[PDB]
Amino acid sequence: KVFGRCELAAAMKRHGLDNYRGYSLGNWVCAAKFESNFNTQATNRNTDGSTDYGILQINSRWWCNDGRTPGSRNLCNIPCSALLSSDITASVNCAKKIVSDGNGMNAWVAWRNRCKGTDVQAWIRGCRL
């Protein structure tokens, strides 16, 4: 499913991401935008053999199991395919574990290079939240 900007903001807000660990809703929507362009079915293979899955492009090396990433962790205890669902629940719950890991949202390369330090509030403008 390809989410609309405001549609995703409402879904994330409902799942408790607004201000989660200090990150305003705009940050999460901005990350999703540049990580997957709001597409829950986005996948991307990396040089190390791991793959990124879903709206927030969660990596198979540490967070989910896809059966083809040797010696990888499944810290979120879920098959990576679950992160491609039109229902973002799995993605959101795993993201909450990732952002609490220590480096905050810097774990997401797109957020660090394209959202961090910008006017992220602009991503939820005009939305009925």
PDB file of C-alpha atoms in Angstrom:
ATOM      1  CA  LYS A   1       0.000   0.000   0.000  1.00  0.00           C
ATOM      2  CA  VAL A   2       1.173   3.517  -0.836  1.00  0.00           C
ATOM      3  CA  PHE A   3       0.166   5.871   1.975  1.00  0.00           C
ATOM      4  CA  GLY A   4      -0.872   9.469   1.613  1.00  0.00           C
ATOM      5  CA  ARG A   5       1.130  11.978   3.652  1.00  0.00           C
ATOM      6  CA  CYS A   6      -1.665  12.832   6.128  1.00  0.00           C
ATOM      7  CA  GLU A   7      -3.041   9.304   6.110  1.00  0.00           C
ATOM      8  CA  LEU A   8       0.283   7.952   7.360  1.00  0.00           C
ATOM      9  CA  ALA A   9       0.684  10.727   9.928  1.00  0.00           C
ATOM     10  CA  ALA A  10      -2.668   9.755  11.438  1.00  0.00           C
ATOM     11  CA  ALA A  11      -1.776   6.055  11.444  1.00  0.00           C
ATOM     12  CA  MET A  12       1.571   6.682  13.125  1.00  0.00           C
ATOM     13  CA  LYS A  13      -0.020   9.031  15.663  1.00  0.00           C
ATOM     14  CA  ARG A  14      -2.580   6.359  16.521  1.00  0.00           C
ATOM     15  CA  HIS A  15       0.191   3.809  17.068  1.00  0.00           C
ATOM     16  CA  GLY A  16       1.935   6.104  19.544  1.00  0.00           C
ATOM     17  CA  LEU A  17       4.839   7.440  17.476  1.00  0.00           C
ATOM     18  CA  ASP A  18       4.169  11.148  18.051  1.00  0.00           C
ATOM     19  CA  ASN A  19       6.890  12.345  20.445  1.00  0.00           C
ATOM     20  CA  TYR A  20       7.979   8.754  21.054  1.00  0.00           C
ATOM     21  CA  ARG A  21      11.415   8.933  22.679  1.00  0.00           C
ATOM     22  CA  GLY A  22      11.304  12.676  21.993  1.00  0.00           C
ATOM     23  CA  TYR A  23      10.759  12.597  18.224  1.00  0.00           C
ATOM     24  CA  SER A  24       7.822  14.642  16.956  1.00  0.00           C
ATOM     25  CA  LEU A  25       5.452  13.107  14.419  1.00  0.00           C
ATOM     26  CA  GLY A  26       6.985  15.133  11.587  1.00  0.00           C
ATOM     27  CA  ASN A  27      10.281  13.270  11.986  1.00  0.00           C
ATOM     28  CA  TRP A  28       8.692   9.857  11.447  1.00  0.00           C
ATOM     29  CA  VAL A  29       6.713  10.950   8.383  1.00  0.00           C
ATOM     30  CA  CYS A  30       9.825  12.545   6.900  1.00  0.00           C
ATOM     31  CA  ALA A  31      11.802   9.326   7.458  1.00  0.00           C
ATOM     32  CA  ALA A  32       9.113   7.177   5.840  1.00  0.00           C
ATOM     33  CA  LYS A  33       8.948   9.551   2.878  1.00  0.00           C
ATOM     34  CA  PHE A  34      12.632   9.267   2.037  1.00  0.00           C
ATOM     35  CA  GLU A  35      13.139   5.660   3.096  1.00  0.00           C
ATOM     36  CA  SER A  36      10.274   4.154   1.099  1.00  0.00           C
ATOM     37  CA  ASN A  37       8.259   7.001  -0.448  1.00  0.00           C
ATOM     38  CA  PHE A  38       5.333   5.865   1.719  1.00  0.00           C
ATOM     39  CA  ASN A  39       5.274   2.388   0.115  1.00  0.00           C
ATOM     40  CA  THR A  40       4.841  -0.515   2.558  1.00  0.00           C
ATOM     41  CA  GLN A  41       6.132  -2.968  -0.060  1.00  0.00           C
ATOM     42  CA  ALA A  42       9.508  -1.323  -0.605  1.00  0.00           C
ATOM     43  CA  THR A  43      12.541  -3.597  -0.395  1.00  0.00           C
ATOM     44  CA  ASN A  44      16.214  -2.876  -1.020  1.00  0.00           C
ATOM     45  CA  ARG A  45      19.199  -5.238  -1.009  1.00  0.00           C
ATOM     46  CA  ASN A  46      22.486  -4.126   0.563  1.00  0.00           C
ATOM     47  CA  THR A  47      26.088  -5.019  -0.282  1.00  0.00           C
ATOM     48  CA  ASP A  48      26.461  -7.068   2.903  1.00  0.00           C
ATOM     49  CA  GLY A  49      23.646  -9.385   1.824  1.00  0.00           C
ATOM     50  CA  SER A  50      21.004  -7.950   4.134  1.00  0.00           C
ATOM     51  CA  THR A  51      17.747  -6.403   2.936  1.00  0.00           C
ATOM     52  CA  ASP A  52      15.691  -3.425   4.134  1.00  0.00           C
ATOM     53  CA  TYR A  53      11.922  -3.911   4.410  1.00  0.00           C
ATOM     54  CA  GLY A  54       8.816  -1.757   4.428  1.00  0.00           C
ATOM     55  CA  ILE A  55       7.784   1.798   5.133  1.00  0.00           C
ATOM     56  CA  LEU A  56      10.750   2.372   7.463  1.00  0.00           C
ATOM     57  CA  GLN A  57      13.183   0.068   5.667  1.00  0.00           C
ATOM     58  CA  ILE A  58      14.049  -2.106   8.655  1.00  0.00           C
ATOM     59  CA  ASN A  59      17.226  -4.145   8.094  1.00  0.00           C
ATOM     60  CA  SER A  60      17.379  -7.962   8.216  1.00  0.00           C
ATOM     61  CA  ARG A  61      20.862  -8.050   9.751  1.00  0.00           C
ATOM     62  CA  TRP A  62      19.487  -7.183  13.186  1.00  0.00           C
ATOM     63  CA  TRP A  63      15.717  -6.709  13.320  1.00  0.00           C
ATOM     64  CA  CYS A  64      13.800  -9.319  11.334  1.00  0.00           C
ATOM     65  CA  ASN A  65      14.325 -12.744   9.814  1.00  0.00           C
ATOM     66  CA  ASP A  66      14.160 -13.273   6.045  1.00  0.00           C
ATOM     67  CA  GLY A  67      15.940 -16.617   5.981  1.00  0.00           C
ATOM     68  CA  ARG A  68      18.772 -15.404   3.762  1.00  0.00           C
ATOM     69  CA  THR A  69      20.928 -13.153   5.958  1.00  0.00           C
ATOM     70  CA  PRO A  70      23.542 -15.509   7.518  1.00  0.00           C
ATOM     71  CA  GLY A  71      24.361 -14.971  11.177  1.00  0.00           C
ATOM     72  CA  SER A  72      21.756 -12.253  11.555  1.00  0.00           C
ATOM     73  CA  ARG A  73      19.692 -11.218  14.560  1.00  0.00           C
ATOM     74  CA  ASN A  74      15.899 -11.141  14.747  1.00  0.00           C
ATOM     75  CA  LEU A  75      15.633  -8.581  17.553  1.00  0.00           C
ATOM     76  CA  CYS A  76      12.039  -7.706  16.690  1.00  0.00           C
ATOM     77  CA  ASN A  77      11.061 -11.407  16.595  1.00  0.00           C
ATOM     78  CA  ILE A  78       9.218 -11.252  13.290  1.00  0.00           C
ATOM     79  CA  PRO A  79       9.578 -12.408   9.691  1.00  0.00           C
ATOM     80  CA  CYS A  80      10.655  -9.477   7.528  1.00  0.00           C
ATOM     81  CA  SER A  81       7.613 -10.117   5.309  1.00  0.00           C
ATOM     82  CA  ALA A  82       5.402  -8.919   8.162  1.00  0.00           C
ATOM     83  CA  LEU A  83       6.930  -5.475   7.637  1.00  0.00           C
ATOM     84  CA  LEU A  84       5.475  -5.207   4.127  1.00  0.00           C
ATOM     85  CA  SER A  85       1.851  -5.367   5.286  1.00  0.00           C
ATOM     86  CA  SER A  86      -0.662  -2.596   4.598  1.00  0.00           C
ATOM     87  CA  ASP A  87      -1.094  -2.658   8.385  1.00  0.00           C
ATOM     88  CA  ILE A  88       1.901  -0.730   9.781  1.00  0.00           C
ATOM     89  CA  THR A  89       1.575  -2.154  13.305  1.00  0.00           C
ATOM     90  CA  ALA A  90       4.557  -4.515  12.958  1.00  0.00           C
ATOM     91  CA  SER A  91       6.760  -1.802  11.457  1.00  0.00           C
ATOM     92  CA  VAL A  92       5.857   0.720  14.148  1.00  0.00           C
ATOM     93  CA  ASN A  93       6.448  -1.680  17.025  1.00  0.00           C
ATOM     94  CA  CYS A  94       9.844  -2.705  15.644  1.00  0.00           C
ATOM     95  CA  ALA A  95      10.782   0.942  14.969  1.00  0.00           C
ATOM     96  CA  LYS A  96      10.107   1.727  18.635  1.00  0.00           C
ATOM     97  CA  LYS A  97      12.709  -0.875  19.583  1.00  0.00           C
ATOM     98  CA  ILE A  98      15.199   0.473  17.045  1.00  0.00           C
ATOM     99  CA  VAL A  99      14.928   4.124  18.109  1.00  0.00           C
ATOM    100  CA  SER A 100      15.425   3.091  21.745  1.00  0.00           C
ATOM    101  CA  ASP A 101      18.624   1.251  20.779  1.00  0.00           C
ATOM    102  CA  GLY A 102      20.922   4.171  21.574  1.00  0.00           C
ATOM    103  CA  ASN A 103      21.573   6.247  18.447  1.00  0.00           C
ATOM    104  CA  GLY A 104      17.980   7.409  18.212  1.00  0.00           C
ATOM    105  CA  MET A 105      16.674   8.090  14.715  1.00  0.00           C
ATOM    106  CA  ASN A 106      20.228   8.349  13.390  1.00  0.00           C
ATOM    107  CA  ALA A 107      19.763   4.610  12.779  1.00  0.00           C
ATOM    108  CA  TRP A 108      17.877   5.682   9.655  1.00  0.00           C
ATOM    109  CA  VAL A 109      20.320   7.037   7.083  1.00  0.00           C
ATOM    110  CA  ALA A 110      17.634   8.948   5.171  1.00  0.00           C
ATOM    111  CA  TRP A 111      16.449  10.680   8.345  1.00  0.00           C
ATOM    112  CA  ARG A 112      19.967  11.722   9.290  1.00  0.00           C
ATOM    113  CA  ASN A 113      20.771  13.055   5.816  1.00  0.00           C
ATOM    114  CA  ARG A 114      17.419  14.479   4.779  1.00  0.00           C
ATOM    115  CA  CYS A 115      15.274  15.170   7.843  1.00  0.00           C
ATOM    116  CA  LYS A 116      17.547  15.896  10.797  1.00  0.00           C
ATOM    117  CA  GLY A 117      17.841  19.632  11.372  1.00  0.00           C
ATOM    118  CA  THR A 118      15.120  20.552   8.881  1.00  0.00           C
ATOM    119  CA  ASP A 119      11.604  21.916   9.356  1.00  0.00           C
ATOM    120  CA  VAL A 120      10.019  18.497   9.883  1.00  0.00           C
ATOM    121  CA  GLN A 121       6.784  20.014  11.163  1.00  0.00           C
ATOM    122  CA  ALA A 122       6.138  20.819   7.506  1.00  0.00           C
ATOM    123  CA  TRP A 123       5.453  17.114   6.942  1.00  0.00           C
ATOM    124  CA  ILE A 124       2.249  17.172   8.998  1.00  0.00           C
ATOM    125  CA  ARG A 125       0.960  20.580   7.862  1.00  0.00           C
ATOM    126  CA  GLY A 126      -2.652  20.741   6.726  1.00  0.00           C
ATOM    127  CA  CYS A 127      -3.342  17.335   8.281  1.00  0.00           C
ATOM    128  CA  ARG A 128      -6.352  16.677  10.485  1.00  0.00           C
ATOM    129  CA  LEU A 129      -4.555  15.126  13.466  1.00  0.00           C
TER     130      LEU A 129
END
